[PDB]
């Protein structure tokens, strides 16, 4: 189970951010 | 109770400042400041500022030859 957990953590470490998943043009512009 | 004909311009701070600069050069452009995102402009100058402003913005964008 630990190795499976480590593999899951390894996959998470490699996952790209959310903003890369979808084109964030329609959403409100970044800022404070 | 007082009405004043004009053109309501909605834009962003960056465009707002550009309109002010054009208004500084030509006084009649802006008739009154409403808010940080709304301006009152002369209807006659609308057709001229739109085309000239694009030329000014062309400097900020690099068109290769």
């Amino acid at each position: 189970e630990l190795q499976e957990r480590q593999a899951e953590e390894k996959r998470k470490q490699n996952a790209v951010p959310e903003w890369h998943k979808q084109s964030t043009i329609g959403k409100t512009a970044l800022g404070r | 109770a007082r009405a004043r004909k004009g053109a309501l311009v909605q834009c962003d701070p960056s465009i707002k400042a550009l309109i002010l600069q054009i208004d500084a050069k030509m006084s009649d452009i802006v008739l009154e400041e409403l808010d940080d995102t709304h301006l009152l402009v002369n209807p006659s100058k609308v057709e001229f500022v739109k085309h000239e402003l694009n030329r000014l913005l062309s400097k900020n964008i690099y068109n290769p030859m």
Partner: protein, 615 residues
């Protein structure tokens, strides 16, 4: 174009319609389209004979754009001049071109290939006892070279300094000069017994580059271009190991020179006794018959003020007749003064190593008669998909300019305008959120900034180390080692000094705040820091490159102008108009108007021997 009726839509193509020619019956197999006017070459990468042309085209035609499916090459005089050097005649080029072309080759194209593919291989420049002799294999050349307005079996002397003049003159005249070294039969120069250790693993593209150079058997002078981090250093090691003669290496940095020696030692069997490092720190030279001196252009190109300690070494370098010179980052040699070295120093063969062979001025083409033609170039995406280099999720973040600062942008001058829109508060907030988000992801981040003032302000505000010109070598080395091996320092703040030739195998993420206007080369060099990441083969690995730029500023002019080279390679930038989850971060810099106003003013304000006792 005979008896070809124009089409109704032929006016859309201004003297560019190529429908007048006919298509061969074997079009389905032949992958090549040839432009009869501009020489453009469209290549099918999804049809047979694609691989057989992917290498031939690179030799005779420079690559304009090579995207996934359809590659774009172009035939030019320089491209042909590069192919003719490596044992290629007009017949070979025409035969292969026709055999692979869907459409017949026009007469104009045939004429172009014939003219430039016959010049190479009639005049040779040789060196003997530090004396330059322009040796020719036939006596007829004497009536040409000796009678030339510029110049001055038969062999005649020529001024060492005038090499840069005659070589350019040779370009104008029919016959250009070729620098071939028969190191096998050269016994006068002391030999060096060095070889690559068994642990070495020459990658397939490295072998192809060497084959294009040693195909005939005689070393040719020229330039080799490989992607950043591809191993250009190892390329010089292999050439030294096979030549087995005294060699000198010039590298454009102090840290990088330290990198070359360590790499030399690790990859080949060069004994330490035969290796000497000519740098500012130590100035002792090898006394063995054959050795290696690794220096920089500033130590070989400087002419006015050389130190007494550094003056003896310069005489040591000049006195001996070197057999090979390795010019790392050959994109700096065609400068105003660096070109002087090629004429002063004596060497029978010259090699150029650079990841980027482009520059703002037109002097790049001068490399043909300075060091020689371009032998080989390697694709970027091809190595990315094969696991040789990491994949990158290139991104471009648009940070709107704050209202307060933008007001001064209009009135302010160009010189001060740069600082105004580079330090807008919004960029500070985005950088802090990205750093925190990526740090928890276990990613080593690099933040580039050409402006030193911004670097210090960002560094001090976030309490992170920064590096630039004034920092001593000892301190930066400690910083680099700590960042490399110490988990506490996960992010750093690089500057123009670290723009190229520094290896960070642990780096995976890359950020850039400021930039040196429109230079497309600096863009590629900076990206190279993360292209050599440690885990570039694990499943789903994708490096990240963020480019924060102020909207409605001159940065868009510079951004789209300094990123036109990566697009040609194949890289695609993703536009990030909004960064998800940026507002929920607890604290952001310059969140209140009071801080913004304070920063605005702070940045705006920036612009008788006995009498000796008396005295």
């Amino acid at each position: 174009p005979a008896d070809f009726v124009p089409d109704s839509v032929s006016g859309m193509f201004r003297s560019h319609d190529f429908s007048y020619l006919r298509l061969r019956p074997d079009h389905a197999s032949r992958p090549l389209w040839i432009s009869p006017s501009d020489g453009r070459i469209i290549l099918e990468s999804f049809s047979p004979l694609a691989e057989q042309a992917q290498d031939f085209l690179v030799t005779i035609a420079e690559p304009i754009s090579r995207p996934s499916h359809i590659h774009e090459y172009k035939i030019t005089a320089y491209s042909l001049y590069a192919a003719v050097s490596v044992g290629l005649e007009t017949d070979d080029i025409i035969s292969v071109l026709d055999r692979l072309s869907k459409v017949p080759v026009a007469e104009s194209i045939i004429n172009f290939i014939k003219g430039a593919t016959i010049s190479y291989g009639k005049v040779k420049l040789v060196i003997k006892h530090n004396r330059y002799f322009v040796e020719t294999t036939q006596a007829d050349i004497l009536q040409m070279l000796l009678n030339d307005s510029v110049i001055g079996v038969h062999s005649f002397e020529i001024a060492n300094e005038s090499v840069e003049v005659v070589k350019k003159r040779c370009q104008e005249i029919d016959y250009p000069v070729l620098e071939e070294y028969d190191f096998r039969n050269d016994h006068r120069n002391p030999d060096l017994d060095i070889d690559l250790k068994p642990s070495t693993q020459i990658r397939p593209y490295q072998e192809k580059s060497l084959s294009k150079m040693f195909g005939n058997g005689r070393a040719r002078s020229g330039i080799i271009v490989l992607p950043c981090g591809a191993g250009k250093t190892l390329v010089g090691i292999t050439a030294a190991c096979t030549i087995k003669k005294s060699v000198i290496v010039l590298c454009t940095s102090s840290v990088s020179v330290m990198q070359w020696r360590q790499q030399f030692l690790q990859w080949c069997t060069l004994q330490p006794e035969n290796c000497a490092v000519f740098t500012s720190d130590n100035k002792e030279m090898f006394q063995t018959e054959s050795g290696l001196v690794v220096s920089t252009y500033s130590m070989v190109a400087n002419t006015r003020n050389r130190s007494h300690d550094s003056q003896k070494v310069m005489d040591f370098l000049t006195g001996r007749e070197w057999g090979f010179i390795i010019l790392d980052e050959v994109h700096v040699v065609p400068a105003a003064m660096f070109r002087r070295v090629v004429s002063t120093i004596a060497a029978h063969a010259k090699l150029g190593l650079t990841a980027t062979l482009v520059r703002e001025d037109d002097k790049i083409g001068d490399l043909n008669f300075l060091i020689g033609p371009k032998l080989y170039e390697a694709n970027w995406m091809e190595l990315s998909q094969k696991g040789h280099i990491a994949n990158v999720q290139c991104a471009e973040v648009w940070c709107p300019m704050t209202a307060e600062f933008y007001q001064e942008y209009l009135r302010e001058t160009a010189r001060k305008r740069m600082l105004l829109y580079i330090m807008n508060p919004t960029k500070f907030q985005a950088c802090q959120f990205l750093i925190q988000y990526h740090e928890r992801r276990g990613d080593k981040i690099i933040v580039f900034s050409d402006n030193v003032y911004a670097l210090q302000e960002y560094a001090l505000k976030m309490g992170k180390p920064f590096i630039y010109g004034s920092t001593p070598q000892q301190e930066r080395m400690n910083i680099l080692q700590n960042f490399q091996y110490n988990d506490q320092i996960n992010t750093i703040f690089l500057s123009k000094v670290g723009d190229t030739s520094i290896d960070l195998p642990e780096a995976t993420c890359l950020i850039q705040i400021s930039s040196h206007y429109g230079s497309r080369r600096q863009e590629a060099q900076r990206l190279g820091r993360i292209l050599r990441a440690k885990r570039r083969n694990d499943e789903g690995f994708n490096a990240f490159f963020y480019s924060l730029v102020s909207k409605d500023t001159q940065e868009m002019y510079y951004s789209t102008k300094r990123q036109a080279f990566l697009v040609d390679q194949g890289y695609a930038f993703k536009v990030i108009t909004h960064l998800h989850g940026m507002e929920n971060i607890p604290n952001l810099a310059y969140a209140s108007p009071r801080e913004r106003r304070e920063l605005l003013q702070e940045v705006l304000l920036k612009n008788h021997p006995l009498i000796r006792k008396m005295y």
